[PDB]
Paper text:
Spiroviolene synthase (SvS) from Streptomyces violens was first described by Rabe et al. and represents a bacterial class I diterpene cyclase that we were not able to produce in sufficient quantities for crystallization due to protein instability. Terpene cyclases such as SvS form a variety of complex multicyclic compounds with potent biological activities via carbocationic, electrophilic cyclization cascades of relatively simple substrates, either by metal-ion assisted release of an allylic pyrophosphate (class I mechanism) or by protonation of an oxirane/ene-functionality (class II mechanism). We previously reported a hypothetical ancestor of SvS—SvS-A2 26—which shares 77% sequence identity with the extant enzyme.
The variants could be grouped into four categories based on their substrate preference in a Malachite Green assay: promiscuous (I), inactive (II), diterpene-specific (III), or sesquiterpene-specific (IV). One representative variant of each group was subjected to crystal structure analysis, and Cα rmsd values in the range of 0.35–0.68 Å compared to the parental SvS-A2 structure indicated that none of the variants had significant conformational rearrangements. Furthermore, the studied variants were dimeric in the crystal structure and maintained a substantially elevated melting temperature similar to that of SvS-A2. The single residue exchange Ala224Ile (group IV) reverses substrate preference of the reconstructed ancestral enzyme and enhances specific activity for FPP approximately 3–5-fold (Malachite Green assay/GC-FID) compared to the reconstructed ancestral enzyme. Spiroviolene formation could not be detected for this variant so that a ratio of apparent second order rate constants cannot be derived. The isoleucine in this position is conserved in the two bacterial sesquiterpene cyclases SdS and HecS (Ile220 and Ile217, respectively),31,51 indicating that it may be a specificity switch of general importance in directing bacterial terpene cyclase sesquiterpene specificity. Changing this residue might affect metal binding as it is located upstream of the NSE motif. Steric effects are also likely to play a role, since the larger size of an isoleucine side chain permits sesquiterpene binding while hindering the correct positioning of the bulky diterpene substrate in the active site. In contrast, the Ala224Ile exchange slightly increases both the melting temperature of SvS-A2 (from 71.3 ± 0.0 °C to 73.4 ± 0.1 °C) and of SvS-WT (from 58.2 ± 0.1 °C to 63.6 ± 0.1 °C). The Ala224Ile exchange reverses substrate preference, and due to its conservation in a functionally related sesquiterpene cyclase, we speculate that it may represent a general specificity switch in bacterial terpene cyclases.
Numbering used by the authors:
A (entry chain A): 9 to 89, 94 to 235, 241 to 311, 327 to 360
B (entry chain B): 8 to 89, 97 to 234, 243 to 312, 327 to 360
Amino acid sequence: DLPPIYCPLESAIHPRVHEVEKRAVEWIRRSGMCASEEERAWVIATHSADFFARFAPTAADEDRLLATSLWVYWGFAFDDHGPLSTRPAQFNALAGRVQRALEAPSAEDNGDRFVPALQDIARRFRSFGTPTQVRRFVHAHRAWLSGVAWQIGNQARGHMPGLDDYLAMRLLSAGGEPTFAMLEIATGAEVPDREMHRPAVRALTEMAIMVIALDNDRHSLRKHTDQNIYSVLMHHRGMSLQEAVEEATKLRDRILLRFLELHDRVRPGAGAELSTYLQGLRHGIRGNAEWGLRDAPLTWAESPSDSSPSPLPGAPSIAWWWDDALLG
Amino acid sequence: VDLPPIYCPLESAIHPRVHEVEKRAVEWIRRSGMCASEEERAWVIATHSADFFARFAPTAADEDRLLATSLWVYWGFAFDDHSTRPAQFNALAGRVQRALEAPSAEDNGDRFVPALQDIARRFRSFGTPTQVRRFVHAHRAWLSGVAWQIGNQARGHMPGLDDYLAMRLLSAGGEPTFAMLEIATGAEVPDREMHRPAVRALTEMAIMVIALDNDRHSLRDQNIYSVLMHHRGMSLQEAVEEATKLRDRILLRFLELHDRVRPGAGAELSTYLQGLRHGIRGNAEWGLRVDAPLTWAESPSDSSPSPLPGAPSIAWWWDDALLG
């Protein structure tokens, strides 16, 4: 099992990653996010500065890379530590309160450990980004919390989503959206509304997010009714773990090929800011996989395990990624 | 039981082609396959939602954009009104929101999806992709609210004031409603103007006043009256007078900030802001009628310029230093 990852994309890391990691650890200790020192050590152990420094490896301002890096840490923390992990009614309200604290500086925590921390991140994002960029992050942020709400709903009932619902869900629950909405904030490069919201750019962003979500599901086979591509396929298709491992890799490789074919057609015409955003998507895909396999020599697959130029069978909710009349 | 007149010194108007739009919308609702029982579809038709939204965009040059936007209002009443346990809802919001963002998404026997996807297609043939994403994000924000409200209900959590006002911001469906003014008008608001805090604040304040006017339309399950009675130990009448003072103080702040922002605003942000105003008044007026003369309070029941205490989620509406 576990054949090497197909990832023919640029790998790079911010030359100031060590300095930014140092500050992030310091922020985390004063963040009051986590109860014990033992937990904070888990949050530090995510090496989320190493991670987000692979997405924005030429960020001119160490401060913007630090601010965005902080959210990746806050992100892990929020998701791991729960009592709410099969209590969707309570989570719906937590989600609402936390999302509100992101949009309303005046909002008060109510002994919620996470809120003041998020509110510090938000204060940073307003210092750096335009109100437009902040809203892009806020909206992405709620998108993610809708994903998590969906996933927690499923856990409560013991619902194993099928392929369509599972892929739809993970675009959101895996944190891809708020992660990519921080590119602009890290780099400074304000992508205009006309370009950022082209269907073709939306598709590329989702495809980037979906490959990262599937790389993460693969990364979580290093441990049975947990919600992941493997369980989904074993349930709905009657496959063995090994057969589903091969199917997962076929699907994921097909999405990545589409991402590269659409990138190859969009990028030539892209303006400077969109081009920088699109390099982030690529640096992100590769950075995720690389960060997941941790300077030991790493093996990659030279070819994909499936190169069908058409949409995924059984996943109509993503078929539009392949429809060029609806895009560019 | 005894209820004062509403303070609402805002322009009242309704699209001149409203009757022709209702005609077409009634017909789409018959051909929508949304509610099976015809009896149900009559409940939807009797929202008179075209009449509601014709008040928000009364000079909209294209009758088809006012039709498209009006369908969504019917859809929202139909979806929200008439499986809805929190766990199943989180999945249901997930799918419906995905069907709005992804035209290739397949109904899978859900009755609301094909109809929302028809609305989406119309929105995509009129609005720029920018205008559609604003509506999309607004639509999720509402679904997040309805999820919050369904959560509290199933657990027996009466929220405090702050939480209730935050929730209702979303669950009233004011965001998706106001995110349709641009799609009705065709007046493209540039991002540097739309995402100004000042404009966010004017948009949320219009939304909150609509949500609190809607609450007053229910004294005839979570509402400001229930919330204030539970957390402050008021009678129904102690809380009706308290609810009116919060609302009237929010609408005062709305008029104040509008008067600061409006002279500088460009043609398109200006159309939007008149849309906020037409919207608040339309909602109040539509609330009563659903047609002989209405009475209005000439004066606010509480003209304090300060932020509401015990509602820090909304205090920033009043902080000018933060509305650069």
